[PDB]
């Protein structure tokens, strides 16, 4: 019995419940072991055969590509990333009481009991763009331990529903719409480090990572526009970096708001002149907001 | 507010549910803890 | 939100089924959270399994239900063998591709109520989901 | 725990040629089975 | 009064020593003679020194460490230490049935094992006498049936009374914290303590 | 996690077969775990093999079973050479190119009970999976 | 390490065959792992060769078997020249592209028993594989 | 095969062996002509082999060699050679991998490399001023023998243990075509798994310190 | 006692030297005269220093070395060692049949081989006299038939009695250990010791 | 080392090969070895055109123990024998290196004739054999 990605399945387990992300578009994974190795050249005997031992599982990266789904289940990714939640609203807390990131657990399932299980994991990145294409959400995860296993927890009601219909992006400031959009791209992060725990007590045992601590969070965005001016002497659309701009970005079904932001600009003399805005919140800014709305 | 639950075994009688497995069953085809040398000395 | 009331149980043929539940109050205003067992006195529990959400669907079985040690917030619920075998007999035939031993049966819902008016005489859902049957070979 | 059997061609009685192979049987020949019961019976009869 | 560790507290694995350094100190006075002889004179005790280092620590396991160390400081007691690399049970039996004759002194012990013990020590094993906190190290061993003899380093700090018993297993060093007079922990804004290390010297 | 109830077995033909299982409580209080044998007094094990998961599938054998030690918490199950020989003629005829000896035999299912009822529940499904036979050429 | 029970055999035509084997128990609780000769008292060996796994497949030969050095874990098995002739006559004509001197001939198994404790016996399939004949031009 | 002989394997007819420890310090020096029409020739004076490397990847096995040379010049002529000519190419045949005569299911590829890591001794001196300088001697740093195998992920039955991910050790391993054979008497295996569209496994192979001499054999087709 | 090595315990393959540093120590009074002359006078013994570094060690082989060193400390004996690169043979024969005239002194030795020896030593070979621990280096050799003449450094510590025998192979230095008062070892997290090294000195 | 050993002969030149047998024991390191006493052993062999039991014979070796205590034995062919092979080997003269030419297969037995009236046999070597053509008398 072989195995096939085209009929693989992914299940996320947390809080003693399980989430079936049915609408997976892609995923990629590796697994590896670390080894210690020495060749011990010695003038008595210039040994040619190395001496080596396997010690530890490498921390696997995981990468996922997911389509937006009506029934919104993927909002739990932001919940696990560490946004606070208010119904469908998510907020960054201006300062955070966490030290450890939210640990959770993953099954990869296939026919013939041919299953794999990743025991301790955390989200490191969520990242997407509204670039004139069906918005696909990337996720970066790390996991500290894996094993193969014969079985998995069933999950059947918490299934990611049908994909939401396409709609075009809008950008605005105080209800001014912004002319000549080209793209918007967003990323959110939870930078972390594993605490190295290996000890001489672990000798002749295989070792794993077990705990990590949160270094930082980031929220940031990029916008691409065509260069435009209202009249030659105008000042509002100049190059110079504005600051304390309130900024709002939405589709039909998703909304993001920065109450105050700092804008860098870069200009490119491509065949049509292009401008990139780099966006970041200001230190005094209020909580950035995110909302989701289901299509009827 | 929170509800926690577990399956009701036949051996455990009844007790508060818990956030871990309790029992473990271990399987093997043979016992390695007893040697033939011991068991033979014991009979002999 | 329906995201966290919901638990897909799996019964198994020719053998009775039973669960035990602990009710905890919590507040995470301190880390780790403050937690206590809810005193369950004067509550009672109900629920049934039916083959469909539709209003005409069949009642497949009623749970046996019982509080125990109500001061510690425990309660227990169960199905007899006669129930398990009847639903075994009445569930769908189409075996699940990842696990041919198991078959879909239907939907269930557990709701609880206050039998003394306290601050309310009222009822609410506590747990929902759908029920699968593992087939089984030995009697 | 595991037990290792070495086996090798026999050329002339008690003499053998180098080409060698290894079996790694996953459970010791010393590990017991239900013999435990009858051994306990006969030890108790000795008692 | 063991220094807490993963065996005592498997939940607090960070307490596993990242690496340990064992030093012999053998204070000696020595000179080199112009005819190329070397001459040396011994006075004062040999003693074992130990250095320990720890990784980054989370607040819980750190608090458990401080709760230990301050209890030690208040009581003025001793710190007991296990040393995992020597944790092998190659000798076992009714140790308390062995007879050591009185008046053995200097570096050789002979014992009547009475045929009781099973297995044998190895060079580099630890060895201890039941009534005294010292830890010795086996240089060499011999059998003559039930009689054993072992030559041991350093030299014995006591004359045998005949009440002693050998101790091959579970040897703990008894030590106190020479670093401890300026102890303290950095706290980084990660919420994690750092820079902890311990220098220990046996004491009797 | 999940119980890992799913285990598959291989029987070497023309030779007796036996399996031993021990039930333990475990307390993780210290690094060498505080495991304790469960008292098995007044419990019994049943189990059978059938050719397919069906209402009227063929039955190949019933396990021989016993308790070896009520206080070491150990039960054992076994099959005679006559049983496994009855298997070897009715298991299927396919053989793998790289593994010609191994043949599918059937589905199996181990069920445990108290000999005197707790009534609220009386038995549970310990373990299940499928059985393969390995062909052999000696007697 | 790998639990390999499987080894193929190459007998040679017109020449008697014999194989010697040495039993050692290896314990890896302490390093390096300790290898100890198995006291081979009271064990006994059998084995047979036949042209296919089939339940009707005819026997081509059976081993002479003997213990050699019980304190050292040594035993031996062998086939007489006449047996070798029967193998060579029955075997395939088909040759092997990796070594055209080898021809396939059958399957074998050296089932082993112990009868040491309590006058009661048990048996297990210690080693298994295919057997080939190599052709020889010297007669 | 003389490439392996120059690389520093010991030779026993067609058999080659790695010696477990080696008496060389300098690698085996040798000399190369590149020849063309019209006396248009080039000559490389001191050289050593640094690598030999090949794979059995479902294609006509091509052997790569890496060499270094310390000096070159152009020259008008070359030594004739006519009986020691590399003959006709051997016919194709498929790879097999095995352990103790167990064949291994679902192969995808095998790749091998062998090395003789060396350093040139820098010799340049103030005596060399206003002269052109060359390297002249090198010393052997290390040898390596290593291999990779790619397989499809397969299991015999779900609870099996023999084909798990976990790294085996002390595996005897044998790799061959019709005409070439390589044997590691004991080896250490790392595993890596890739969830490509069909699950793939890579084994990384290395000899253990106690292992006996790895063997190589060649056989001519008829 | 002979230092353990891959000759004495070939299974302890790690136990050979990763590097060595044979240093000559030759104490002199030196003076620099205003006329630019440099004067040197030889006084006190020349003595060989030896620094050795081991590779990383596994615990078992380390424990063997540790026990050896402690047994040396306990006895107060001498450490005997053989350099392998000099160990390579050149001369062979029954050295017992060589005869050395008494009363030779100064840096030149002559001897009668009677034709018994085979091969000849090279410059930079080691040389030793059987009755005295000092080791010498051959600066040059001259044959004349079966008689040999050798120029050695340092000069002979003793006049030939006429009962010496030469020894060209298996020459052991007799030494004393300079680190012994503070020796100590770090268990690396990977389970190995590192930096294990010895500063030996000859002693006469 | 396997049983497999190829052989190359020289046309129109007598051929001879020498061996000695030893016991080995690596329980002493470096591995001990001692010459095996060959008293009573004897050898046989033939060269035949194919592995087929019907194949024709081409030549038979002469062979002799040469020193039982050194455990040494030798094998040879005369030029008349080699000539017989030269007449009958294959003629697939390689287009690029024509001197090598295939002739057949060979097997060498020894019989441990010994006191006690037992006898046993084992094959010491087996392989292919080639001629190299001989341009000079």
Q: How far apart are the first and last CA of chain H?
A: 18
Identify how the structure was determined: cryo-EM
Region class of A82: left (phi > 0), else alpha (psi between -120 and 50), else beta: left
In angstroms, the Cα distances linking I189 to A41, A131, A199 are: 22, 50, 6
CB H111 within 8 A of CB H4: no
- Report the distance separating Cα G124 and Cα G43, nearest Å: 11
| Spatial CB neighbours of F20, under 8 Å, sequence gap ≥ 6 | B27, B28, B29, B30, B31, D33, F68, F74, F75, F76
- Report the distance separating Cα G44 and Cα G64, nearest Å: 12
- Report the distance separating Cα E114 and Cα E99, nearest Å: 8
For A15, nearest residue in chain C (alpha carbons): C4
> Which residue in this structure is represented by tokens 């294409």?
A133
CB G76 within 8 A of CB G63: no
Question: Chains I/F: 3 or more C-beta pairs closer than 8 A?
Answer: no
For residue G62, the Cα-to-chain-centroid distance in whole angstroms is 10
CB H118 within 8 A of CB H50: yes
How crowded is residue I85: how many other Cβ atoms within 10 Å of its Cβ?
10
Q: Are strands G9-12 and G128-134 parallel, antiparallel or unpaired?
A: parallel
Total length of chain B: 44
Asked if C98 lies within 8 A of A157 by C-beta distance, the reply is no
CB H47 within 8 A of CB H33: no
Q: Is J112 on the interface with D (CB under 8 A)?
A: yes
Q: CA geometry: angle at J19 spanning J17 and J24, to 5°?
A: 160
> Nearest CA to E135 among E145, E120, E144, E125?
E125
Asked if G109 lies within 8 A of F16 by C-beta distance, the reply is no
- Report the distance separating Cα I89 and Cα I55, nearest Å: 26
CB G61 within 8 A of CB G49: yes
Q: Is G78 on the interface with D (CB under 8 A)?
A: yes
In angstroms, the Cα distances linking J90 to G100, J5, J50 are: 19, 20, 12
Total length of chain I: 204
CB H207 within 8 A of CB H153: no
- The residue ranges of DSSP E strands in chain A, in sequence order, are 9-14, 17-20, 24-31, 33-38, 51-57, 60-67, 84-86, 89-91, 104-109, 115-129, 136-143, 146-149, 170-173, 176-177, 181-194, 212-226, 243-250, 254-268, 274-281, 289-292
> Nearest CA to I163 among I199, I139, I129?
I129
**HSE toward the beta carbon, residue F71, CA cutoff 13 A:** 0
Region class of C97: left (phi > 0), else alpha (psi between -120 and 50), else beta: alpha
Asked if J6 lies within 8 A of H14 by C-beta distance, the reply is yes
Region class of E124: left (phi > 0), else alpha (psi between -120 and 50), else beta: left
Total length of chain H: 222
In angstroms, the Cα distances linking G54 to F17, F135, G47 are: 21, 9, 16
Asked if A157 lies within 8 A of C128 by C-beta distance, the reply is yes
Question: Closest to H188 (Cβ–Cβ): which among A2, A48, A52?
Answer: A52
Residue I27 DSSP SS3: coil
Question: Closest to F138 (Cβ–Cβ): which among G47, G55, G57?
Answer: G47
Query: Which chains, if any, share at least 3 CB pairs under 8 A with chain H?
Result: A, D, F, G, J
> Nearest CA to I180 among E46, E89, H100?
E46
Backbone angles phi, psi at H61, to 5 degrees: -65, 120
CB G110 within 8 A of CB G127: yes
Report residue H27 as tokens: 């690698």
> Nearest CA to C11 among C109, C126, C98, C91?
C91
- Report the distance separating Cα I72 and Cα I177, nearest Å: 10
Q: Is the bond leading into J20 cis (omega within 30 degrees of zero)?
A: no
For every residue of chain E, DSSP letters joined together read -BPP-TTT-GGGGGGS-SEEEEEEE--EEEEE-TTS-EEEEE-S--EEEEEEE---B-HHHHHHHHHHHHHHHHHT--EEE--GGG-----BS-GGG-B--TT--SSEEEEE-TTT-BS---TT-EEEETTS--EEEEEEEEEETTEEEEEEES--SS---S---EE-SS--EEEEEGGGGG---EEETTTEEE--EEEEEE--
Asked if B26 lies within 8 A of F24 by C-beta distance, the reply is yes
- Report the distance separating Cα A212 and Cα H93, nearest Å: 52
Alpha helices in I29-156 (DSSP H): 59-75, 84-87
DSSP F115: S
Residue F85 DSSP SS3: helix
Which residues are registered as beta bridge partners of H98? Answer: H103, H174
CB C78 within 8 A of CB C91: no
Q: CA geometry: angle at A96 spanning A92 and A97, to 5°?
A: 145
Query: Which chains, if any, share at least 3 CB pairs under 8 A with chain A?
Result: C, E, F, H, I
In angstroms, the Cα distances linking H166 to A4, A56, D28, H155, H204 are: 22, 11, 22, 13, 12
User: How many CB pairs (< 8 A) connect E and F?
Assistant: 9
Q: CA geometry: angle at F110 spanning F108 and F114, to 5°?
A: 160
How crowded is residue H124: how many other Cβ atoms within 10 Å of its Cβ?
11
What is the side-by-side order of every strand in the sheet holding E197-202?
Answer: E79-81, E173-177, E197-202, E47-53, E19-25, I184-187
In angstroms, the Cα distances linking E82 to E135, G54, J31 are: 12, 62, 43
Cβ-Cβ contacts under 8 Å, H185 against chain A? none
CB I170 within 8 A of CB I89: no
Resolution of the solved structure (Å): 3.8
CB F88 within 8 A of CB F135: yes
DSSP A81: H
For residue F86, the Cα-to-chain-centroid distance in whole angstroms is 17
> Nearest CA to A218 among A112, A92, A121, A115?
A92
Residue G45 DSSP SS3: strand
> Nearest CA to J9 among J47, J42, J43, J65?
J47
- Report the distance separating Cα A66 and Cα A235, nearest Å: 41
Q: Are strands H215-218 and H15-17 parallel, antiparallel or unpaired?
A: antiparallel
For every residue of A199-242, DSSP letters joined together read -GGGTTS-B----EEEEEEEEEEEEEEE---SSTT--TTSSSPP
Alpha helices in chain A (DSSP H): 75-81
> Nearest CA to F109 among F43, F47, F20?
F47
Backbone angles phi, psi at I100, to 5 degrees: -110, 120
| Spatial CB neighbours of A294, under 8 Å, sequence gap ≥ 6 | A70, A71, A72, A164, A253
CB A42 within 8 A of CB A51: no
- Report the distance separating Cα E7 and Cα A202, nearest Å: 11
Residue J88 DSSP SS3: helix
DSSP A16: T
- Report the distance separating Cα H32 and Cα H81, nearest Å: 12
**HSE toward the beta carbon, residue A295, CA cutoff 13 A:** 13
Q: Are strands E108-112 and I47-53 parallel, antiparallel or unpaired?
A: unpaired
How crowded is residue J131: how many other Cβ atoms within 10 Å of its Cβ?
22
Q: Is A150 on the interface with C (CB under 8 A)?
A: no
Q: Is C68 on the interface with B (CB under 8 A)?
A: yes
- Report the distance separating Cα I3 and Cα I79, nearest Å: 7
Asked if B34 lies within 8 A of D36 by C-beta distance, the reply is yes
Cβ-Cβ contacts under 8 Å, C31 against chain A? 97
Report residue G91 as tokens: 């075997």
Q: Are strands G112-114 and G43-45 parallel, antiparallel or unpaired?
A: antiparallel
CB G136 within 8 A of CB G14: yes
């Amino acid at each position: 019995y072989y195995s096939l990605m085209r009929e693989s399945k992914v299940i996320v387990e947390y809080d003693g419940r399980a989430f079936h992300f049915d609408a997976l578009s892609n995923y990629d994974v590796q697994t590896s072991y670390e080894e210690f190795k020495t060749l011990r050249r010695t003038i008595h005997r210039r040994t040619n055969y190395a001496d080596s031992v396997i010690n530890a599982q490498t921390p696997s990266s995981i990468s996922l590509a997911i389509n937006f789904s009506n029934t919104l289940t993927e909002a739990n990714f932001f919940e696990w990333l560490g946004f606070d939640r208010k119904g469908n609203t998510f907020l960054l807390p201006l300062y955070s009481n966490n030290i450890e990131p939210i640990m959770f657990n993953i099954y990869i399932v296939n026919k013939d009991n041919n299953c794999v299980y990743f025991e301790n994991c955390y989200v490191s990145t969520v990242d997407f763009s509204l670039d004139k294409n069906i918005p696909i959400l990337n996720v970066g995860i790390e996991s500290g331990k894996f094993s193969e296993v014969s079985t998995y927890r069933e999950a059947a009601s918490i299934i990611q529903g049908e994909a939401m219909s396409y709609s075009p992006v809008i950008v605005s400031t105080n209800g001014n719409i912004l002319p000549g959009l080209i793209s918007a791209s967003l990323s959110f992060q939870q930078q972390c480090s594993w605490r190295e725990d290996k000890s001489v007590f672990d000798i002749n045992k295989i070792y794993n990572n077990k705990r990590a601590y949160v270094n930082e969070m980031n929220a940031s965005a990029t916008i691409s526009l065509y260069y435009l001016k209202r009249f030659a002497g105008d000042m509002v659309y100049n190059i110079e970096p504005e600051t304390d701009v309130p900024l709002n970005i939405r589709n039909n079904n998703i909304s993001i708001d920065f109450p105050l932001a700092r804008i860098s600009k870069r200009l490119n003399f491509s065949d049509v002149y292009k401008v990139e805005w780099d966006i970041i919140p200001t230190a005094s800014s209020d909580p950035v907001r995110i909302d989701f709305f289901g299509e009827i | 507010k929170i509800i926690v639950q577990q399956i009701l075994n036949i051996d455990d009688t009844t007790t508060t549910a818990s956030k871990y497995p309790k029992y473990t069953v271990v399987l093997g085809n043979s016992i390695s803890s007893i040697t033939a040398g011991e068991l033979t000395a014991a009979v002999e | 939100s329906t995201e966290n009331r919901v638990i897909d149980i799996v019964v198994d043929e020719k053998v009775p089924y039973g669960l035990i539940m602990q009710f905890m109050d919590v507040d995470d205003s301190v880390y780790p959270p403050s937690e206590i067992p809810v005193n369950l006195t004067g509550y009672s529990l109900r629920g049934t399994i039916k083959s469909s959400l539709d209003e005409n669907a069949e009642t497949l079985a009623s749970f046996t239900t019982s509080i125990i040690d109500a001061a510690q917030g425990a309660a227990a619920i169960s199905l007899s063998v006669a129930d398990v075998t009847n639903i075994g007999e009445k569930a769908s035939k189409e075996r699940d591709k990842y696990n041919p031993r198991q078959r879909f049966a239907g939907y269930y819902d557990i709701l609880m109520t206050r039998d003394v008016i306290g601050s309310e005489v009222s009822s609410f859902r506590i747990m929902e989901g759908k029920v699968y049957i593992s087939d089984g070979v030995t009697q | 725990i595991v037990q290792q059997i070495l086996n090798i061609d026999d050329t002339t009685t008690t003499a053998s040629k180098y080409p060698k192979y290894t079996v790694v049987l996953g459970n010791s020949i010393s590990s017991i089975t239900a013999g435990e019961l009858t051994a306990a019976v006969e030890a108790s009869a000795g008692s | 009064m063991r220094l807490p560790d993963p065996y005592t507290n498997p939940e607090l694995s960070g307490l596993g020593f990242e690496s340990v350094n064992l030093i012999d100190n053998d204070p000696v006075i020595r000179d080199e003679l112009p005819n190329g002889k070397v001459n040396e004179v011994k006075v004062s005790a040999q003693y074992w020194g130990i250095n320990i280092s720890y990784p980054e620590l989370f607040p819980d396991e750190y608090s458990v460490l401080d709760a230990f160390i301050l209890e030690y400081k208040r009581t003025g007691g001793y710190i007991d230490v296990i040393l995992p690399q020597y944790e092998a049970f190659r000798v076992r039996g009714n140790t308390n049935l062995v007879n050591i004759p009185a008046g053995q002194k200097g570096s050789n012990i002979t014992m009547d094992t009475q045929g009781v013990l099973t297995g044998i020590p190895k060079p580099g094993d630890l060895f201890k006498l039941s009534n005294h906190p010292k830890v010795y190290k086996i240089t060499s061993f011999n059998r003559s049936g039930n009689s054993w003899s072992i030559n041991v380093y350093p030299d014995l700090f006591i004359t045998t009374t005949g009440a002693e018993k050998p101790v091959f297993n579970g040897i703990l060093f008894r030590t106190k914290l020479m670093n401890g007079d300026a102890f303290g922990s950095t706290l980084n804004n990660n919420g994690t303590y750092s820079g902890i290390s311990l220098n220990l010297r046996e004491s009797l």
